[PDB]
Amino acid sequence: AVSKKEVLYFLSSKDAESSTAVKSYLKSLYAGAQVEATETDASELIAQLEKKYLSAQVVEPGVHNIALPLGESGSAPVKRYAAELFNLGAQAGFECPFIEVSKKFGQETATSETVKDVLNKTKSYVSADYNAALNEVLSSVEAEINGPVLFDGKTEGFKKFAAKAKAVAVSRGLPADTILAYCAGSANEDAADKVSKEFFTWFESAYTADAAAEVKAIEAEAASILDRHLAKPVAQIRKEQASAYASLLKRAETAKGAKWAEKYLEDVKAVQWFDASVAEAPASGPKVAA
Amino acid sequence: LTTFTFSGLQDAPVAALSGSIKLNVAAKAGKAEVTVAAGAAKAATQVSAAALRKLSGSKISLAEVARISVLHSSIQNYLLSLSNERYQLLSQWPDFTTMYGKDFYYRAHPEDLKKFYDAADEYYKLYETVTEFDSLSALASQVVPNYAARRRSTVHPAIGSTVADGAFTNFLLSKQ
Amino acid sequence: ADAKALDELRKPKFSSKYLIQHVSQKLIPAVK
């Protein structure tokens, strides 16, 4: 339940079983047990892989405690949803999403020479409608420059490429000046913070647009799934769902000795308890210990 | 919420807003005279200034007890609020039972009466399957895994295309 | 019996967290 690197990730989380294992470990430490030494080993690849597989154990049970704001009109449900995903990323050891995906860009193209190669390497992280708009600008300046546009910063091909990529990004709706002013910085705080307040209006626009796109896809998927399901007769629905339940339950009763399967069956028993305790008192809810 | 909060007996509500419960505070500089009045039973006390500041010393920290999860219950509530939208248009279906009598049987063409009885059987199919609300849970369990795999992103749980394109705008238009 | 707890009920159920933990426990020693 605790492996002494799991419990360091679970300190800053507010999830239920994570705080339960944290409280059990802290309670065992209060009865005179000793803190294990933190391993000063497992070099950068193993460290980043273990970070990836330790933050996911904070992320994914914390995703299931975030209610999707489906069918909710307005700004506040989508802002609540994106704020809860932000706080979940902060609890899991992520940075800001801007800083984290810019770190992904800097890690991917630490080795590139030409700008079409940074477009071939950050292909997976930018939208293809933006990648195509940058590729056509790159071919446009490549026709006139008669050289591969290198990733330099001061070459005339790069300057006349960036002066057009700023134009296409202004066309997309991304204010490139305020984003560059925030991520570059300024001296006087009363003129750096007046553009940080514009970067944060763009940033709030950006993450509510992304969370609303996720909510719209889940709405469309649930409506498509229901309207495929409402066309069946009831006996087909009952036998299909009973077969799916029985197969997924046999998959967990097949593998024994694993921790996930016995947690799966404990959770099935907990759903049966929830049904039983609602059955014994339906106008008050499930029986919570108080 | 935070560890130190700074509210209580200052710019507080002086009266209730609806007539379902009556509440008045006769606040002096030091303490307050509150009489809460709700129907049959009404209560009254003198709440200190050092009590409304001492109330947020411990936190309640409310949390939802769900059958499976809160995400699953949000998806199931959406499925239920869509099945209500389909039920509302199975609610405006015309009563075919007012045309079952034998004066409607023998006046009608045989194939049109067979089509009419098939339409009645079809409505019973649609109404029997739109009110199978014990299927919505296993329908919501089909939206959960793909969404929850999209939130196990290697970048961030909250990352999307707009923030990643804006960060590529910052990254590409900086000095390499 | 009934009336289980409060922290035992706040936990989301069919999240993975133990397939991720199983993949960590079968992967991180195998890559060390």
Binding site: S124, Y245 | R67, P145, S153 | -
Partner: peptide, 30 residues
């Protein structure tokens, strides 16, 4: 009510693939 447990990551950043509108409301009005 239970779902298949998956342990895999999303290495790309993609728009979330909105699904097409079904004709079930139009077919039930028909």
């Amino acid at each position: 009510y239970l779902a298949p447990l998956r342990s895999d990551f999303t290495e790309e950043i993609t728009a979330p693939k909105v699904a097409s509108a079904s004709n079930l409301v139009n077919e039930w009005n028909n």
